[PDB]
Design a protein around this ligand. Structure first.
Ligand SMILES: COCCOc1cc(OCCOC)cc(C(=O)NCCOC(=O)[C@@H]2CCCCN2S(=O)(=O)Cc2ccccc2)c1
Length: 191
């Protein structure tokens, strides 16, 4: 076999690639960034825990068919997944430099939401339409009221919301099933 299949995951979704075994991984890395809209985010691609160089081939890295490449935005101070008392998980992919969001403010965000299997169920970016809500008002699922608080303007935060802080046994929108854990990436546009 001269070709190899590889999966790239960023913790939110996944993309599969078929490339020649002797081809540098540069094109695969750029194609993943373009499709996920994370070109300017300076991604790092890891295989077996070691950062991939663009000029390295799957042959160089002794990759086998269906191996997995992990991609992430470069994290100053290391990756940190925070689990709160309620079971909500959040991860500051980009810490914002602006004002901090607090309960009672009308905040504006861009968001994409995925199920845990990587299937996207909604994205405000797909509509070129920022989403606004009153923080802490019970107008969104509980994981959002808890997880968006403390974000700073310009920040990107990934929320992993257990079902009892999301849509629970009911699901939502004819796409989110019962008992679904939800994954959101939220960019705070204004507070
Ligand atoms: C009634 O007609 C059947 C369609 O049912 C839909 C459709 C819908 O969006 C359409 C908007 O497009 C123009 C929202 C909803 C819904 O319950 N909103 C409540 C607020 O939402 C939330 O609290 C979370 C967190 C904040 C961002 C949005 N979300 S979400 O998780 O992405 C909401 C969602 C989106 C798609 C599928 C399932 C859920 C129901």
């Amino acid at each position: 076999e001269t070709h190899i299949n590889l999966k790239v995951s960023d913790g939110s979704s996944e993309i599969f690639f078929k490339i020649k075994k002797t081809t540098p991984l540069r094109r695969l890395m750029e194609a993943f960034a373009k499709r996920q809209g994370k070109e300017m985010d300076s991604l790092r691609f890891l295989y077996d825990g070691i950062r991939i160089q663009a000029d390295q081939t799957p042959e160089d890295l002794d990759m086998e068919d269906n191996d997995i490449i992990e991609a992430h935005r470069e994290q100053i101070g290391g990756s940190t997944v925070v689990t709160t008392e309620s079971g909500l998980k959040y991860e500051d992919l980009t810490e914002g430099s602006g004002a901090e969001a607090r309960a009672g403010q009308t905040v504006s965000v861009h968001y994409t939401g995925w199920l845990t299997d990587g299937q996207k169920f909604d994205s405000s970016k797909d509509r070129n339409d920022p989403f606004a809500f009153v923080l802490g008002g019970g107008m969104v699922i509980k994981g959002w009221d808890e997880g968006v608080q403390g974000m700073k303007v310009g920040g990107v935060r990934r929320l992993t919301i257990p079902p009892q802080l999301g849509y629970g046994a009911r699901g939502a929108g004819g796409v989110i099933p019962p008992n679904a854990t939800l994954v959101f990436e939220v960019e705070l546009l204004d507070v």
